[PDB]
Amino acid sequence: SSVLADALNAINNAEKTGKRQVLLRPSSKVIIKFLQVMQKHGYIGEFEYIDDHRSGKIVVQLNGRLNKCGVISPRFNVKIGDIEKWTANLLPARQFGYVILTTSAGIMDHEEARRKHVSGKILGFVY
Amino acid sequence: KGISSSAIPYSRNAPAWFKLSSESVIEQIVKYARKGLTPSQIGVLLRDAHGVTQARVITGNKIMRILKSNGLAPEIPEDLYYLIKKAVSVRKHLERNRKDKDAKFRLILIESRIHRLARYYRTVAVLPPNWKYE
Amino acid sequence: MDFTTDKLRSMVRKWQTLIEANVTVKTSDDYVLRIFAIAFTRKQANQVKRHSYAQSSHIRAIRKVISEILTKEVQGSTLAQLTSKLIPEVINKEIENATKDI
Amino acid sequence: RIKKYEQEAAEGGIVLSKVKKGQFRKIESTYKKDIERRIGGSIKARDKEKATKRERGLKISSVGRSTRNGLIVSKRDIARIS
Amino acid sequence: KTIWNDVTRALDKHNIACVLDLVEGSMTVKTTRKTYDPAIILKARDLIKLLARSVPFPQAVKILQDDMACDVIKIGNFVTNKERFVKRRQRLVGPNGNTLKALELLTKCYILVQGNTVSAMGPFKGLKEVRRVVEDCMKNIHPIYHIKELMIKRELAKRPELANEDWSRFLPMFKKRNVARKKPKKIRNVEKKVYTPFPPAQLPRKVDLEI
RNA sequence: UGGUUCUCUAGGACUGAUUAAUAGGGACGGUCGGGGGCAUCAGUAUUCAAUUGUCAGAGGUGAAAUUCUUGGAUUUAUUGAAGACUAACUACUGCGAAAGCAUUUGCCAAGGACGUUUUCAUUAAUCAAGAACGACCAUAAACUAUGCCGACUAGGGAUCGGGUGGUGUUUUUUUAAUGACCCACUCGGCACCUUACGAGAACUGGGGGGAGUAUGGUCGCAAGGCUGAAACUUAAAGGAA
């Protein structure tokens, strides 16, 4: 499996089982930015990067507000004009959740990406 | 599958009781290698008796780099050499007694494992291409 | 010499191991004897696990010392000396004392 | 009675006949006491709540396949949406 | 420990002492000074090993009477694989225990299928019947054939005539099911596929073929 | 550092980038197992034979029978030979990729788990294809069964292999090392008993439910009526009553 996918799988089903903390290993910059944007929108609480010298561990604390993480496995390019279409086709509803993209300006959600007018490849979603 | 490996400490320093020299360790390393031990045996003897924890920490670099920069390079990597000699030991067992179908099966497994990392070492070109396992 | 069958059927219980040995020994005369031995693995007092099995290397070591010390009790006996030795069951006490270390 | 009987037989050697998962093991007191007319062969409330199927939430997405590697969106769908 | 006083009653009417040792875990029976029946110590032996083999007490004191004896059939040494062994032994027990209970009823015996042996108590004709039933059940023929022929033989033995004629025409047990015979030309089965101990090498990958 | 004799007390030959995955491989260590191969050893049955002892039956069956038997069967005792097999111990235990594997001892290679402040440094995971294992003497396999699946949380008791710690009893001593049990922790297994939470979708040949009912259709099979005995009112004999 991937390295973002099993971290998001742990952070998904741990919250489904109703835990208040996940430990996810290993940890990359893209995982830090994904948890960064989802705590910017308020889906997880704090999280902490314990640096062992191998790859890093994250302890996320998460309350109740998430209900699905994911990754879109072909990292196809989206456009600023088709951000609205891709959110319509993969989100649950109209203003429900965020598609998260790797852009020129880094990892951002879809509405921040179209706010500062930059497209990029898709990464994953959260709602 | 079991989880039984070694747990490298978080420190990257000499342990502050290691009063020996960073060069006398290298001289002991090349002495043991020239009297003829594989690098894993150098590391375990150095760890057990002259208490360097690990020599990538206490010396500059790892000990196969120390042996290659001091002139004691291996003909073939230690993994491939040990798997080669295990395969030829099973092959001599099979020529001795020819009703050991289980040992024939283990020979197929050992030969597959030979080809895997021989392919890896060949595409890295540690060992030259047109290398065959006889 | 031979046991009755009811004695060793009365000795065999499950949840233990029987270590049995035998040696073909020539005495201080020129009688050659095949002499057997049986032993059953006890459980200690305070043992709470129900098994008390031997780990089969303890079986090989126990059977080794059984063979060695009873082939030491023969060759060091004649037939009359061996018979007077195995009437009061004392080679069994020699085996027990030599094997309680294992 | 059933647990004591099948536990006694299990700690002995005794091979017992095989029952299904929620049923009561039929024993000599079952046949003599006429107990199954009063208690049934199995607790059918637990049989009903085990025979029901798991409540599988509400289906959300439509765009791709959802496996443990994430969401596969096919190239046909990428060309259709883009 | 519970039933032990009943054992002392049921043996002291035969003048046999018995101890129950609870530290070494044993049961001994001894002929005392007042035992005029010479053979009853054998039935006391069978009684205490029945108690050890985990039959209950009101079942096991029916061994102290002359018309009843034990048998311990051995079923472990018949078939090879564990799957076929446990399926034939469960076939010996039956669905819901029906085969075993019908066998106890027909043979007038008490049968325990335990481990890899079969204990049985009963009269000697019943013991002969259950031994042949169990051994042929460990061989491949199903035990309900033997239950059917036992019912046939009971309803065939309760008539006054036909008691010196052979019942083999009435028994359906004689099946004549051995009626196949392979008749190929033996192309490879004469001598094919000689065994060599050394394996062939593997087809290498495209990576290997290019390096 | 010594070949000896005079009381430790007497000379002697002497080049120029990172980790080190609760990914993978390899080494090491003490081990572990009914994993395999070869050799060896034993056991008591069985069958056969030799030698006694004794005499009329022995098998076998629901009863019988084929069979053996005064040229001594069966039973008993001593001994030999053969081919198998490894009883009880034997387990919801172990090992093996599966089929499978149970006597001892030795050799040959192998394997797993654990321990590791050893080594290499991505060498990795899945499977269509393909490969390995699976003229003589003639043989059985299935046959009542079960269960909700996975990418999934925690446990509980018991058990097998390793390790660490504790500090009591069996052990014991200046010959080597080495146990057994109790307890806690921990890793890995064969199972068992529970829990919480998830879309879990996108050796080949097949008609259409279960239980029945009717039939002016089609294809069949089937009745009569004493036989002999019909062209013959016909014998003997048989049947029936």
Structural domains of chain B in order of their starting residue, each with its CATH number: 19-73 (no CATH), 74-134 (1.10.287.10)
In 3D space, the residue among A107, A85, A111 whose CA is nearest the CA of residue A97 turns out to be A111
- Does an H or E element contain E26, and which? strand E26-31
Verify cis geometry, omega within 30 degrees of 0, for the bond prior to E56.
no
CA-to-CA separations, E58 to A34, E2, E10, E125, in angstroms, rounded: 75, 13, 11, 22
Chains B and D touch (3+ CB pairs under 8 A): no
**Residue in B119, B121, B127, B132 to test binding to E, most E beta-carbons within 10 Å:** B119
Q: How far is C59 from chain E (nearest CA, A)?
A: 23
Q: How far apart are CA E175 and CA E154, in angstroms?
A: 20
In 3D space, the residue among E176, E80, E79, E69 whose CA is nearest the CA of residue E131 turns out to be E69
Query: Which residues in chain E are closer than 8 Å to B123, comparing Cβ atoms?
Result: 207, 211
Contact predicate A4/A34, CB 8 Å: yes
Q: How far apart are CA E206 and CA E211, in angstroms?
A: 9
Q: For chain D, which chains pass the contact test of at least 3 CB pairs under 8 Å?
A: A, E
Q: Say how many Å lie between the first and final Cα of chain C, rounded.
A: 28
Chains E and B touch (3+ CB pairs under 8 A): yes
* Contact across the interface for B122 and E211, Cβ inside 8 Å: yes
Quick one: DSSP state of residue E97?
Answer: G
In 3D space, the residue among C97, C95, C94, C100 whose CA is nearest the CA of residue C21 turns out to be C95
Give the nucleotide at minimum CA-to-C1' distance from B45: F118
Tell whether C13 lies on the interface with E, counting CB pairs under 8 A: yes
Q: Which residues contact E17 (CB under 8 A, 6 or more apart)?
A: E11, E29, E30, E31, E32
Tell whether E97 lies on the interface with D, counting CB pairs under 8 A: yes
Q: How far apart are CA A8 and CA A69, in angstroms?
A: 6
Tell whether C14 lies on the interface with E, counting CB pairs under 8 A: no
Q: How far is E21 from chain C (nearest CA, A)?
A: 13
Helices (H), chain B: 24-34, 39-49, 55-58, 63-69, 78-96, 101-124
Tell whether E140 lies on the interface with B, counting CB pairs under 8 A: no
Q: How far apart are CA D77 and CA D66, in angstroms?
A: 14
Q: How was this structure determined?
A: cryo-EM
- Does an H or E element contain D14, and which? none
Question: C59: helix, coil or strand?
Answer: helix
Query: Which residues in chain E are closer than 8 Å to B131, comparing Cβ atoms?
Result: none
Length of chain C equals 102
**Residue in B3, B5, B10, B57 to test binding to A, most A beta-carbons within 10 Å:** B10
Query: Which residues in chain D are closer than 8 Å to E96, comparing Cβ atoms?
Result: 17, 26
Query: Which residues in chain D are closer than 8 Å to A31, comparing Cβ atoms?
Result: none
Of D12, D17, D26, which has the smallest distance from its Cβ to E93's Cβ? D17
CA-to-CA separations, E195 to B94, B104, B109, B112, E203, in angstroms, rounded: 13, 11, 19, 21, 21
Instruction: Give me the residue label for tokens 């199995």.
Output: D42
Q: What angle do CA D14, D16, D19 make, to 5 degrees?
A: 160
Q: Which residues contact C14 (CB under 8 A, 6 or more apart)?
A: none
Contact predicate C35/C73, CB 8 Å: no
Resolution in A: 3.2
